[PDB]
mmCIF file of C-alpha atoms in Angstrom:
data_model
loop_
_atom_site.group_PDB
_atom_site.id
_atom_site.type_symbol
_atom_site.label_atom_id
_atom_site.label_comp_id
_atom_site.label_asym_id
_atom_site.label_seq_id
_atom_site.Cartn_x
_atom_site.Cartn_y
_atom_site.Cartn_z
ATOM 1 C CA UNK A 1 -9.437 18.319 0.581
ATOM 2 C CA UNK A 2 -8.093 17.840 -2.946
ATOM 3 C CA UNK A 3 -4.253 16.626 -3.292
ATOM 4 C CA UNK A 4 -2.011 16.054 -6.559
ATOM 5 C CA UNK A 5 -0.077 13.342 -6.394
ATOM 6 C CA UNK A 6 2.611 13.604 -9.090
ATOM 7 C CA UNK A 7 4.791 9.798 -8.442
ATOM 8 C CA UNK A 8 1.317 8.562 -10.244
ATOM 9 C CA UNK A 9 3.016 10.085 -13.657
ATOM 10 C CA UNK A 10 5.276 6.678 -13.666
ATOM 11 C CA UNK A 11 2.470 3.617 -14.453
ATOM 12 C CA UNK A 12 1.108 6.149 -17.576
ATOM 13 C CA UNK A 13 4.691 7.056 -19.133
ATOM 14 C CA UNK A 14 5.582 3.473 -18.055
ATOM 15 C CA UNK A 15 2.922 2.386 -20.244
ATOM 16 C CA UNK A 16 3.357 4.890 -23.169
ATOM 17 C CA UNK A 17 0.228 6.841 -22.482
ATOM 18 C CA UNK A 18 -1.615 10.405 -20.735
ATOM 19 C CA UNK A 19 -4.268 11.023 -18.431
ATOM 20 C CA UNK A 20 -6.053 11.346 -15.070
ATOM 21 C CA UNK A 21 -7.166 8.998 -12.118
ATOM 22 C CA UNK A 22 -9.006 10.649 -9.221
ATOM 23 C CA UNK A 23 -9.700 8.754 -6.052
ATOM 24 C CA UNK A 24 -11.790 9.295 -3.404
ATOM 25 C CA UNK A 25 -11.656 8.112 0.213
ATOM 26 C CA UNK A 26 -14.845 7.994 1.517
ATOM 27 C CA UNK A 27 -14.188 7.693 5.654
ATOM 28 C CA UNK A 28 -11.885 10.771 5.121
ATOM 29 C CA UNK A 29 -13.824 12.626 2.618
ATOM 30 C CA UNK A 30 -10.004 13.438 1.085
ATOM 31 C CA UNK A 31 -9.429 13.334 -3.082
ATOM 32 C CA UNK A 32 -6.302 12.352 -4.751
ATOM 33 C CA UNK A 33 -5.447 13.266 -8.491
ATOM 34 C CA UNK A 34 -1.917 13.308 -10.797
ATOM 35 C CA UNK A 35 -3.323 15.834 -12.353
ATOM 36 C CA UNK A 36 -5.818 18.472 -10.763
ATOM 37 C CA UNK A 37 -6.404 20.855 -14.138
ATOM 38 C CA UNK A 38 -6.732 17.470 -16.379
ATOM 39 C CA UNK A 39 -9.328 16.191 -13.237
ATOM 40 C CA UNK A 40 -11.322 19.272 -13.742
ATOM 41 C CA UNK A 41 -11.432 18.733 -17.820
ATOM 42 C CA UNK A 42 -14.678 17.922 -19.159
ATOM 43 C CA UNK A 43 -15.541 15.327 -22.226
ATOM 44 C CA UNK A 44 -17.952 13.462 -23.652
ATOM 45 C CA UNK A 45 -19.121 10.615 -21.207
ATOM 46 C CA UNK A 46 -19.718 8.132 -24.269
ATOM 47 C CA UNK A 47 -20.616 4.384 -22.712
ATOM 48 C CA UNK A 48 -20.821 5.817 -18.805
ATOM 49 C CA UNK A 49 -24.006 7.319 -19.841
ATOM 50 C CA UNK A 50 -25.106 4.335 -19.653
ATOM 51 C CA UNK A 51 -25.249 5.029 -15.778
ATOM 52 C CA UNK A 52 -27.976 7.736 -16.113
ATOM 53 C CA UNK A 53 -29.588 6.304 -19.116
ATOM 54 C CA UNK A 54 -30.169 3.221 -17.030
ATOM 55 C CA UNK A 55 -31.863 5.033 -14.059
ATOM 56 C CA UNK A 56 -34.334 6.980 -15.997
ATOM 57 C CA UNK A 57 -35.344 4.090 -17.956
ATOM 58 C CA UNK A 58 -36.216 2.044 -15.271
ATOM 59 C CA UNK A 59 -37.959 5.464 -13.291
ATOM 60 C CA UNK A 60 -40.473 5.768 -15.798
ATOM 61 C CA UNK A 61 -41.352 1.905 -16.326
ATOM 62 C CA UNK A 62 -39.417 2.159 -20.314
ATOM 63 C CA UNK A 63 -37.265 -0.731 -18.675
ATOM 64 C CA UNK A 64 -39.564 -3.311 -16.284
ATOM 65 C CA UNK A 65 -36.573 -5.084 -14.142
ATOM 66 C CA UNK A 66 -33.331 -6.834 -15.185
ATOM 67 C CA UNK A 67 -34.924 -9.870 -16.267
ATOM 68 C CA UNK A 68 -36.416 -8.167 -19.651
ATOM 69 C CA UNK A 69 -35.330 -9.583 -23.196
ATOM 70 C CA UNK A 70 -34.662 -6.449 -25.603
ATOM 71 C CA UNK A 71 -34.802 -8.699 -29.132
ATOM 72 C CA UNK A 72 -31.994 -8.289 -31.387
ATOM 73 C CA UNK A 73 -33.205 -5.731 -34.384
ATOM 74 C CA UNK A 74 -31.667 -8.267 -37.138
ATOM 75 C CA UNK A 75 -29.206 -5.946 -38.654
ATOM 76 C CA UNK A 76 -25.559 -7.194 -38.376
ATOM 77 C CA UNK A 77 -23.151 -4.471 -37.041
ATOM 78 C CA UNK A 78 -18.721 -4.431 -36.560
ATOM 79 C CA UNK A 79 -19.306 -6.136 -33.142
ATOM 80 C CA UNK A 80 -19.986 -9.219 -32.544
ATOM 81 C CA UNK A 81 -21.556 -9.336 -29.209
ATOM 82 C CA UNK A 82 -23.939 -6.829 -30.036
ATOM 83 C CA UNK A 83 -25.790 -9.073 -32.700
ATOM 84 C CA UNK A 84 -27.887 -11.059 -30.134
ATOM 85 C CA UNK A 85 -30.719 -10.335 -27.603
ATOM 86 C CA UNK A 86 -29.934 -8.651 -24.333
ATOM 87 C CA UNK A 87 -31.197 -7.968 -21.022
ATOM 88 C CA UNK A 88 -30.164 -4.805 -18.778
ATOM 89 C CA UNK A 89 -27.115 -7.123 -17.175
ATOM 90 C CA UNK A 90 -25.612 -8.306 -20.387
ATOM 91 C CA UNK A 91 -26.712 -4.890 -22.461
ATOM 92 C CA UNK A 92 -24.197 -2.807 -19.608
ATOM 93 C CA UNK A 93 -21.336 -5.625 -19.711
ATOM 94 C CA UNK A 94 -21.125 -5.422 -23.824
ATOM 95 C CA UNK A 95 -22.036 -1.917 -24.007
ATOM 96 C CA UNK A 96 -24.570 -2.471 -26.297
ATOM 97 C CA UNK A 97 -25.343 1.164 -27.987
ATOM 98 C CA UNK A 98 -28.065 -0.064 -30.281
ATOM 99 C CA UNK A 99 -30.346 -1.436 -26.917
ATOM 100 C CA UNK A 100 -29.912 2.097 -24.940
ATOM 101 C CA UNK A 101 -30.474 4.322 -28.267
ATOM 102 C CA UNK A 102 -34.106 2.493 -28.233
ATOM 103 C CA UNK A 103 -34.366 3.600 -24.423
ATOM 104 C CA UNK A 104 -33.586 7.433 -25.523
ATOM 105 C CA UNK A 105 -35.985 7.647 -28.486
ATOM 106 C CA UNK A 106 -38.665 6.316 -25.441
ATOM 107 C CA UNK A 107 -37.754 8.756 -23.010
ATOM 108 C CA UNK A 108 -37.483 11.590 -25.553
ATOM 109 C CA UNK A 109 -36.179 14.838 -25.197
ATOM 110 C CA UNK A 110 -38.307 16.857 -22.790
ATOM 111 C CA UNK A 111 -38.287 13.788 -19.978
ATOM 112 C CA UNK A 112 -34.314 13.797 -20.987
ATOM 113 C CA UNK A 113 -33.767 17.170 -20.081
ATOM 114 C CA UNK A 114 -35.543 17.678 -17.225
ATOM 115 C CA UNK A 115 -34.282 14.351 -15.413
ATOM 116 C CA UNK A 116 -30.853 14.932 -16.184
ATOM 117 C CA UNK A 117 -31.647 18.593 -14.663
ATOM 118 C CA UNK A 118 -32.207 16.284 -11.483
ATOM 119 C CA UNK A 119 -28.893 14.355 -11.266
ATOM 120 C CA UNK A 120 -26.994 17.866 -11.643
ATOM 121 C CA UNK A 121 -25.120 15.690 -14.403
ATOM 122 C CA UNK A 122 -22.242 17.792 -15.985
ATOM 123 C CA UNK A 123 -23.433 21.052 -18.075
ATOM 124 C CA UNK A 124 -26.701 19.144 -18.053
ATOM 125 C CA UNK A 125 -26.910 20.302 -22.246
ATOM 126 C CA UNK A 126 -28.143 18.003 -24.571
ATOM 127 C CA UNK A 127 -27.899 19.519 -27.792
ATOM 128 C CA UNK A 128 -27.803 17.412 -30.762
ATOM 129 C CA UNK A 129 -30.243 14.069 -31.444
ATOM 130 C CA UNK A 130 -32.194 12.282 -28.822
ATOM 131 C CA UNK A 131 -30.548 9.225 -29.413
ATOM 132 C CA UNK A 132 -26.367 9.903 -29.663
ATOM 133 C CA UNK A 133 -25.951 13.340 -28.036
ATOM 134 C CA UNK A 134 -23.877 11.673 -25.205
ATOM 135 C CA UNK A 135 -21.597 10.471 -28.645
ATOM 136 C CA UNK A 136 -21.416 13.234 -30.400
ATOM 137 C CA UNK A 137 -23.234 16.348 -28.943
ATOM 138 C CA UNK A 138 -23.363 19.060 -26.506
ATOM 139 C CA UNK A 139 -23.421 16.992 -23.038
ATOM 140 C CA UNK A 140 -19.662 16.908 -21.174
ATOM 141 C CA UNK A 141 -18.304 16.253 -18.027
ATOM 142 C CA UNK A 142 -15.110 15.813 -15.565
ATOM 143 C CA UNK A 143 -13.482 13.448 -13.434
ATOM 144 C CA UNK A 144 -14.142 15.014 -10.857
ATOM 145 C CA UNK A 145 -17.795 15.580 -11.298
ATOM 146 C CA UNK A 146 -18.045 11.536 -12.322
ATOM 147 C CA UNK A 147 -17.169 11.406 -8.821
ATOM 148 C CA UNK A 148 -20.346 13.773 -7.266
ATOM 149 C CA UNK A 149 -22.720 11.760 -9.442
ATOM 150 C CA UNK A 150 -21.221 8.737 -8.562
ATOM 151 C CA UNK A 151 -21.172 8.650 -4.442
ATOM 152 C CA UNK A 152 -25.188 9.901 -4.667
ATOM 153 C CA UNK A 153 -25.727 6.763 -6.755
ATOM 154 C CA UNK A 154 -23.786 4.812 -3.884
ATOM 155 C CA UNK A 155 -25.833 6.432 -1.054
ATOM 156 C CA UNK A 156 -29.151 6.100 -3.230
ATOM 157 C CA UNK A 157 -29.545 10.005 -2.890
ATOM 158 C CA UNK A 158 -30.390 10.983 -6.481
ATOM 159 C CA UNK A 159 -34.492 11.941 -6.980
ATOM 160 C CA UNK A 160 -35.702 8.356 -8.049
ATOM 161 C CA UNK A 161 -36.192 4.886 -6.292
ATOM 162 C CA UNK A 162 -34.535 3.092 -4.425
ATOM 163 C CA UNK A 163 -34.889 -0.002 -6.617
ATOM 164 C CA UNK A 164 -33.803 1.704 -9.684
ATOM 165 C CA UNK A 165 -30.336 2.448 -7.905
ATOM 166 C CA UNK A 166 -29.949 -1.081 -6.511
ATOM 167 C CA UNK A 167 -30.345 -3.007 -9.913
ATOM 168 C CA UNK A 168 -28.370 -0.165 -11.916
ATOM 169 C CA UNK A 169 -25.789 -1.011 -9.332
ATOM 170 C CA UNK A 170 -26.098 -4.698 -9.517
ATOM 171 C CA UNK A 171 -25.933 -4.220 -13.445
ATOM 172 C CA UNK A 172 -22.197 -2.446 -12.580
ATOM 173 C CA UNK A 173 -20.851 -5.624 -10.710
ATOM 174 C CA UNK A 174 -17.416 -6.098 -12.470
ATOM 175 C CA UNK A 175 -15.324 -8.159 -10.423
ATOM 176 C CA UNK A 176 -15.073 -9.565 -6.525
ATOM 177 C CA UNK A 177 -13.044 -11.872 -4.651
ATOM 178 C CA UNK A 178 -12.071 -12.365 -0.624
ATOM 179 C CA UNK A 179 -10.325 -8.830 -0.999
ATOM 180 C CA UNK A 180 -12.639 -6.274 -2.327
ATOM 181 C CA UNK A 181 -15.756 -5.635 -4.615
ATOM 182 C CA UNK A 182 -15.204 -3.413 -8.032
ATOM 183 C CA UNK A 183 -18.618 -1.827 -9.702
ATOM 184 C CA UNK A 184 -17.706 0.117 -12.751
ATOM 185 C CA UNK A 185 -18.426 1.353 -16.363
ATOM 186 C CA UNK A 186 -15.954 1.638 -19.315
ATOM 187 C CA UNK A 187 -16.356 4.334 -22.020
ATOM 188 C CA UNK A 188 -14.581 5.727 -25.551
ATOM 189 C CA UNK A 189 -14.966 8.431 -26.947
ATOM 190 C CA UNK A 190 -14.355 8.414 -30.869
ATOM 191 C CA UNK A 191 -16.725 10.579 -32.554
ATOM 192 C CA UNK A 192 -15.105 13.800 -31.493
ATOM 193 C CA UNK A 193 -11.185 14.768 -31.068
ATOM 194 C CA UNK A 194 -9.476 14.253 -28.669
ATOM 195 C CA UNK A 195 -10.496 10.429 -28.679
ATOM 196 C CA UNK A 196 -10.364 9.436 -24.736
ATOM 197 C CA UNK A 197 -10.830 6.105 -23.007
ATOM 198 C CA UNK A 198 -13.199 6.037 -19.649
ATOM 199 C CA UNK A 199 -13.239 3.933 -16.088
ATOM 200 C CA UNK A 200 -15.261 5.385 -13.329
ATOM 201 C CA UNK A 201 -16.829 3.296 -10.435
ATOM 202 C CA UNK A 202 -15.905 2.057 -6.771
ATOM 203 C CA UNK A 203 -13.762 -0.603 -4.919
ATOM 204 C CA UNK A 204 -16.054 -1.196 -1.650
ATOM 205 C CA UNK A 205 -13.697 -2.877 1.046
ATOM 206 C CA UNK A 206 -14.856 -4.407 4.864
ATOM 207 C CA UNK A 207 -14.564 -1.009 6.620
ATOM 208 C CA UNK A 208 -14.287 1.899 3.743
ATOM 209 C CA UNK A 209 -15.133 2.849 0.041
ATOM 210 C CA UNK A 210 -13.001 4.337 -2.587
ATOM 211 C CA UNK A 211 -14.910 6.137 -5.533
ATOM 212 C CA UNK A 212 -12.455 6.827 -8.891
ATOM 213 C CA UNK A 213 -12.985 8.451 -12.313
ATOM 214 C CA UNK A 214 -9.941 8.002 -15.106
ATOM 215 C CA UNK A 215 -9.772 9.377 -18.366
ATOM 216 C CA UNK A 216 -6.502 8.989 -20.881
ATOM 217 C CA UNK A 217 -5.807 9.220 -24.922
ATOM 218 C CA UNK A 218 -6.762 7.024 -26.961
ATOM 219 C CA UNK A 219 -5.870 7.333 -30.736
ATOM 220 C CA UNK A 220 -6.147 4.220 -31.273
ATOM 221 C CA UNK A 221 -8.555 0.803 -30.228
ATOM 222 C CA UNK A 222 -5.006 -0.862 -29.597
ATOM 223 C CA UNK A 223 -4.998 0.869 -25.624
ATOM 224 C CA UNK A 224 -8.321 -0.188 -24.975
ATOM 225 C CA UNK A 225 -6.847 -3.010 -21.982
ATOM 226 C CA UNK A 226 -4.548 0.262 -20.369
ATOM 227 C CA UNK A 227 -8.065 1.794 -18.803
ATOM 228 C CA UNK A 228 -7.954 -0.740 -16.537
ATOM 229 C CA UNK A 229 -4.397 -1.884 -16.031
ATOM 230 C CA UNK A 230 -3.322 1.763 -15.292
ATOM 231 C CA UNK A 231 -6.030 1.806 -12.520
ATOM 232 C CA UNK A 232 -5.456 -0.880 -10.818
ATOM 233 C CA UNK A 233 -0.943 -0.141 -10.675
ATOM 234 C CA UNK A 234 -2.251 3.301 -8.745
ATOM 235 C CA UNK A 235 -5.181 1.340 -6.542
ATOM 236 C CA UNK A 236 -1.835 -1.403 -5.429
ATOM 237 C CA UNK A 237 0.874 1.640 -4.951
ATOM 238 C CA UNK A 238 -1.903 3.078 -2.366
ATOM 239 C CA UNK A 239 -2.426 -0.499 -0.697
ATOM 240 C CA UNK A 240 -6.245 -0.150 -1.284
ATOM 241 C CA UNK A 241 -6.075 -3.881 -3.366
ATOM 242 C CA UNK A 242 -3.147 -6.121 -2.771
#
């Protein structure tokens, strides 16, 4: 059920870099990795807790719908994008850390805990403050478990509504054409060593879904476009995008 797939090596030393992508065909229920001991390797999630953050937010009414306007705070900060007001859509697509610290401090730690318990979400351990544990604290996860979180979330199987998984997924929505539909989060990891770059999410297609999770050094900001990139060489070898 789980295959390593070692010609996948080429499109990272191709592009000066190391990591993992796992895929996942859903009609087979078969996984492919280039790497099955990296796959299993957990880190800090950084920006893809945004995922879970986002679904217990809008659970407990903290977040009313994807229309609301989160006002900017007024303090100017490195990125630009950030310095405006936001809505759930536009806080996901700029990954705006300020907006979903405010949801954490709301939720607080107990409700944290035991909701996360829920989602079976990595080593489900929070250590370290309310509001940038998932940056710099005792929370970590895999690939491969990315993956298990991520096909509940497709299914709407994880212990809260319906609507909460429909707009979190709508608030994913990357890119779609005549070909195929791509929902997905980015994240970077910089707080702790080893600084990693994130992309987990799906490519639904007429007749089949593939889930994927990669994770690859990152020493420097300069990679930041090879998340991506690397992703979709490996989705074109396989003939899942043209």
């Amino acid at each position: 059920e789980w295959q390593e797939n070692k010609s996948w090596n080429a499109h990272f030393t191709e592009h000066k870099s190391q990591g993992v992508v796992v895929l996942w065909n859903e009609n087979k229920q078969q996984g492919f990795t280039n790497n099955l001991k990296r796959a299993n390797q957990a880190f800090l999630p950084a920006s893809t807790f945004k995922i879970p953050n986002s679904l217990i937010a809008l659970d407990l009414g903290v977040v009313k719908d994807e229309h609301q306007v989160f006002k900017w705070d007024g303090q100017t900060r490195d990125i630009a994008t950030w310095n405006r007001d936001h809505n759930l859509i536009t806080a996901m697509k700029y990954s705006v850390v300020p907006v979903y610290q405010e949801f954490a401090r709301q939720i607080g730690e107990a409700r944290m805990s035991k909701m996360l318990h829920a989602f079976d979400y990595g080593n489900e351990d929070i250590s370290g403050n309310v509001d940038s544990f998932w940056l710099d604290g005792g929370i970590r996860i895999s690939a491969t478990e990315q993956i298990s979180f991520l096909r509940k979330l497709y299914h709407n199987k994880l212990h809260v509504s319906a609507a909460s998984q429909r707009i979190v997924k709508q608030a994913m929505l990357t890119e779609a054409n005549g070909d195929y539909i791509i929902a997905a989060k980015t994240g970077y990891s910089t707080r702790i060593e080893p600084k990693i770059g994130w992309w987990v999410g799906w490519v639904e297609l007429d007749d089949n879904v593939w889930f994927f999770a990669m994770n690859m050094d990152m020493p420097t900001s300069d990679g930041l476009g090879l998340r991506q990139a690397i992703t979709k060489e490996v989705l074109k070898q396989e003939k899942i995008i043209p």
